[PDB]
Design a binder for these strands. Structure first.
Lengths: 247, 106, 61, 85, 72, 43
RNA sequence: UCUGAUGGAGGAUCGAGUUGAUACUGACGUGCAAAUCGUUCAUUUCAAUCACGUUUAGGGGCGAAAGACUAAUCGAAAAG
RNA sequence: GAGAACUUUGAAGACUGAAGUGGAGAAGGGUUUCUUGUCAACUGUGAUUGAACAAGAGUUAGCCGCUCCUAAGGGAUAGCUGAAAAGUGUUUAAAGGGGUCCCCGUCUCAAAAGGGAAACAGGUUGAUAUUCCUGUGCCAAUAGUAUUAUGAGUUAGAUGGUAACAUAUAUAUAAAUGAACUCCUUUACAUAGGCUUUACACUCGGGGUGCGUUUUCUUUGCACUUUACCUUUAUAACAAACCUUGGAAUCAAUUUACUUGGAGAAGAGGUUCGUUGAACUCAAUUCAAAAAUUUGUUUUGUAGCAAUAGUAAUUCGUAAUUAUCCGAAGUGGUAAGGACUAUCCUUGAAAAAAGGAGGGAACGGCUUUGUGCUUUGCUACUCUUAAUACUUGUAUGAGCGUACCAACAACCGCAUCAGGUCUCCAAGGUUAACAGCCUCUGGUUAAAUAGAAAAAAGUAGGUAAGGGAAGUCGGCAAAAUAGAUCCGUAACUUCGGGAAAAGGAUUGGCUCUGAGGACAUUAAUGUUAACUCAGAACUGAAACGGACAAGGGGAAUCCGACUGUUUAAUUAAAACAUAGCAUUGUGAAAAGCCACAACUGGUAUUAACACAAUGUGAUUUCUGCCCAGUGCUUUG
RNA sequence: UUAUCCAUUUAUAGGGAUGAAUU
């Protein structure tokens, strides 16, 4: 056979991200002594659109403290942030929507976004539009905090890691039915060459394990093992179960 | 009707190659490349256009006289007057509130 | 063509057997509406300026 | 006069796509193209600019909101719990 | 090309060391109207004259170092 | 084309110069000839 | 709730051009042509079309998928 | 000319028909260009022709481009891999510049359509022209010192306006102090829709000039009647924004549309930008009222460029004189600008380069104490533009492209091949129309041939009595109306459609009638413009979308929901895609999927409303039983 | 925690009670 479409993706030739008009990586402020011991407030000056993602991005201007001047940061905007608002980031920042706090400093039950799954990696979890994590527990010894991620998983993160208070904006996007293939085309034109799909069952056996036959069927179980090699992992990969869920 | 042709080596109607037909004293209709219209300079805060300042492309702006690049006030050329007025009041009033917050302490 | 245009001015070659475009293609209904609206608005402004109508009456009309 | 009995703004789609799909897209394009109340100026003039950005035509100030409405109930309740404390 | 209107400035430009020539143009209109154009390094300066008398005194009153060019 | 580089133009001139016949005085004591339409320079 | 205007939406309609290629299974089939010609036909605000630049190279690429295309060469190019 | 259907000239008949064998370019070609020769071969007939052959010649730039910037991206450095070859390109980097210790920082290439310093007209050759000539400009650069001169400022930096903001007019609006350090702006950006302004285009009427028609008619038909860049061009006008005053419900202002207002509307008075580029008495000028300089009335000037050029005429030795080049409009074709509205699960480059600001480091001149610092007597003193003189190495303007074709014979198709091949301009008539058909300017009358005859047969078409699909696998092919206006329009339906359903009527010419606007005077009367509708008489071999152009409809079944895509050269489909639906993996740098020999990488500028892997295939209504088998998967 | 590995940065301040802001 020949190399299948999934295998060709990792070569990264035409499957690199279409990132020409992206405005920059969304990271919150690198850890500073000001953040560690007190608070620092920067004002949000614009709320812009990043073509790849659905969530809006806030341009937050902070005043530099090691030298005279200003620094601009690209944050994922939580819903409710407005231009001219002052965001406060640090250990002593108050608990309000938009502020960046250590997760150990928030009361249990709050909703957060821009979660650092390790302290200082300047923001790695809960970033897609409309998402939010819930702080569901704080360790008695401090230094640990348990949160519920938008997938529903419970994760334990050290209590010094930071997150925005609130919910990342542009929520409910998924609710709109993409009416047509053209809207899908425009959606993926600014993300990736992943569209249209073409079913493997409509292919020839040379290019897909599903291809071939006189009737367009799979012909072998579509649940493939986790150890299956690259050209083989094609169906439902390591499926614990299959079919409609019931609860 | 007299028909024309490009004269400036760019034979495509890109935005930098817009043309305008003129009638010459020799009685023929020729074509002249028009300069691109330049955007207005805008306020640093509200982003609206600043008045009293010409709107020339950088090359023309470099040759423009100093009088019509600036406005004789405070920021005047980078900040609009309304934004400057708000900035004056904010600067004075917020220090006054800081002082009254000090004096209330005891 | 000048003689033909004089005849057309007298209204002489415009019967329904001489029309190939639609009514709107021959005389844009949007342009007709705009012309009428500008005429009426101009008249109302003249009346209000010359004080032949009260300001409220002008607004209602 | 009344130009459509029920299809409303979805008349732009003609007969294409299902009636249920058209109805569902109507129910949210209605609120996507609505004008919301700007709490900063009190004038109902904030419209959606991009998917999550809402700009007031008067203040020129823009806020981050829902994809199709200025606020979303999840974030509305979330903010309310914080304000309670 | 520039047009100068008062006599004082035109004479002053003529007296400059830079100016090289004066162009005298005369032509009928309906009465002969004329115009005198000083050729300086930068610009050609023109003054028009409806008045035959003013025009006929001024070119003479101008000093003869710079060269005459009569176009008519 | 009308737009050329210096080396390309010099090469064209060299080809034109070499496309000339054998001098008559020499012939009284050429095969490598080309026509612009038949065989292209390719260079 | 109804009527008249206004307004100018839409992978809306007709249709030249462009982009293609339904039929005559027309011509031609020692052609004008190793795919053309005629009439007919599809297509024209969008998943639209074109140019140049640029990236992906052979058990590899690229594929809205026909084993299609990758210089008249493809169920494994071409050159030695 | 030896020789002429296909060389040249004149005459005629025609064609192309501004979507052009018309003008300009790119790619590609490379001398095919031009002049003079010229015919062995080639120019599929001829050939005196030629893109053939031969000899000479021809391409002129500070302003047109490249050159510079950065993009998708390429190469290289440091490493690190690898036997190397090579692969990757900050992954333990001590990796030029700025001011005077500190601050910044990989290099390089990549656009002749992106960004970008600055040019126009007239003329000129056999062949080049925004390149030459003439005239007029513009851009950039212009070292040090000293003399002058131009201007400001000062006894270390000017002044007007309440404000929006304005002010340097010297030959030339040059100078309105300003460091470090900063913060912005310009460059700089999508699509759709209409509305509007301007230029160009087209057209109408008047005047002049020339030509044409002239059996008859015709105050007639045609041609010319022009005006570049530059002068911050000055002004004028206008869409906007802003300022002052003002203080809004009986809400008002206002757009085609909606837009806007106690966060300050209307009214009134202003400021600015942007459009444009002599508009407006614009400038100078004549004449009267304001006072120790304003407001009205006139002359001039195509505002300067500028008439000196150009065009069309009349003459004169054969190179000169002459006269004109000015009065009012309409349509909306093209382009650009403006102010707007709308759309996106799509938000539509960057840098070179330039500018503005915040901040306030440094500070007169002659001489002198002592050690850059307090000091003493005196005041006319600093910046800016230009020129000159001397020193500085020679103290302006580099290099390259520039002919010609661009297909019709200059390109690629083995060719002088009916193929292919990117961009700009774009007249009149009819018309919805850049359609078709005919025409003006420009171009052509050429095609690997001609003459004659004219049967069969072929091919590309026309027309056919009566019948009307009986033909045929099959209505294949052809025919049938087909524009516009008025009327009428079913089942079904996702209520949007179906629909131009179906199906009727009318349509020419001529002579009239009615309706639809703008502009001024003391409720009243004149001047003047578009083609657009509606109606009526008459008229004709009953014909009129007269040519051109231009749906056949209907009742049903199958398949695919739809728009879309595809086997370049036998299959365009019911196949693929699709939205919708569902399932699966994955909480992350010890993750999922994938690349790689290694090192390292893609997704990823990513983070579950995400990415990856599958199946089904709009909507509607449903999606039953089986975990024995085989897979996959979970615990011990 | 010193090997080894990961993350972030301009390797930019030791632990407890919508004006600018630098010489």
């Amino acid at each position: 056979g020949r190399v299948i479409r999934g295998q060709r993706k990792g070569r990264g030739s035409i499957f690199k991200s279409h990132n020409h008009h992206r405005k920059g990586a969304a990271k919150l402020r690198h850890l500073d002594y000001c953040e560690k011991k007190g608070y620092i407030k920067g004002l949000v000056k614009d709320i812009i659109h990043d073509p790849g993602r659905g969530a809006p991005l806030a341009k937050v201007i902070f005043k530099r403290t090691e030298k005279y001047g200003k620094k601009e940061e690209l944050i994922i905007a939580s819903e409710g942030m407005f231009t001219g608002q002052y965001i406060s980031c640090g250990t002593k920042a108050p608990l309000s929507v938009g502020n960046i706090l250590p997760i150990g400093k928030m009361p249990e039950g709050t909703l957060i976004c821009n979660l650092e799954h390790r302290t200082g990696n300047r923001g790695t979890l809960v970033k897609a539009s409309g998402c939010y994590a819930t702080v569901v527990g704080q360790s008695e010894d401090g230094k640990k905090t348990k949160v519920r991620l938008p997938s529903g998983a419970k994760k334990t993160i050290d209590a010094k890691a930071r997150a925005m208070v609130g919910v990342v904006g542009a929520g409910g996007r998924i609710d709109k039915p993409i009416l047509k293939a053209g809207v899908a085309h425009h959606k993926y034109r600014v993300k990736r060459n992943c569209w249209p799909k073409v079913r493997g069952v409509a292919m020839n056996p040379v290019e897909h394990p599903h291809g071939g036959g006189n009737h367009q069927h799979i012909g072998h179980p579509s649940t493939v093992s986790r150890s299956a090699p690259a050209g083989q992992k094609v169906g439902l990969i390591a499926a614990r179960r299959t079919g409609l869920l019931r609860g | 009707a007299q028909r024309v042709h490009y004269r400036r080596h760019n034979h495509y109607n890109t935005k930098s190659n817009k043309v305008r037909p003129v009638r010459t004293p020799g009685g023929k209709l020729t074509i002249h490349v028009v300069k691109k219209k330049a955007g207005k300079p805008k306020c640093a805060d509200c982003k609206t256009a600043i008045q009293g300042v010409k709107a020339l492309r950088p090359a023309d702006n470099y040759r423009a006289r100093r009088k019509n690049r600036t406005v004789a006030r405070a920021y005047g050329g980078s900040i609009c007057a309304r934004c400057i007025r708000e900035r004056i009041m904010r600067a004075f009033l917020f220090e006054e509130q800081k002082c009254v917050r000090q004096v209330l302490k005891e | 063509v000048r003689l033909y245009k004089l005849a057309k001015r007298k209204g002489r070659h415009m019967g329904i057997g001489k029309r190939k475009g639609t009514k709107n293609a021959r005389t844009n209904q949007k342009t007709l509406w705009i012309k009428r609206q500008r005429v009426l608005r101009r008249l109302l402004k003249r009346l209000r300026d010359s004080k032949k109508v009260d300001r409220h009456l002008y607004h209602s009309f | 006069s009344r130009r459509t009995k029920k299809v409303g703004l979805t008349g732009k789609y003609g007969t294409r796509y299902g009636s249920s799909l058209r109805k569902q897209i109507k129910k949210i394009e209605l609120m996507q193209h609505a004008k919301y109340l700007c709490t900063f100026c009190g004038k109902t003039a904030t419209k959606r600019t991009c998917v999550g950005i809402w700009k007031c035509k008067k203040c020129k100030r823009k806020v981050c909101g829902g994809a199709w409405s200025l606020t979303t109930p999840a974030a509305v309740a979330a903010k309310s719990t914080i304000i309670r404390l | 090309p520039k047009q100068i209107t008062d006599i004082r400035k035109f004479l002053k430009i003529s007296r400059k060391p830079d100016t090289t020539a004066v162009i005298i143009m005369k032509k009928k209109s309906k009465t002969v109207i004329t115009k005198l154009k000083l050729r300086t390094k930068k610009y050609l300066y023109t003054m028009v004259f409806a008045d035959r008398k003013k025009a006929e005194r001024i070119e003479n009153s101008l000093l003869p170092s710079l060269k005459r060019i009569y176009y008519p | 084309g009308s737009i050329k580089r210096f080396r390309l133009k010099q090469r064209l001139g060299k080809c034109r110069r070499q496309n000339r016949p054998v001098p008559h005085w020499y012939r009284l004591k050429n095969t490598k000839r080309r026509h612009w339409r038949r065989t292209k320079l390719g260079l």
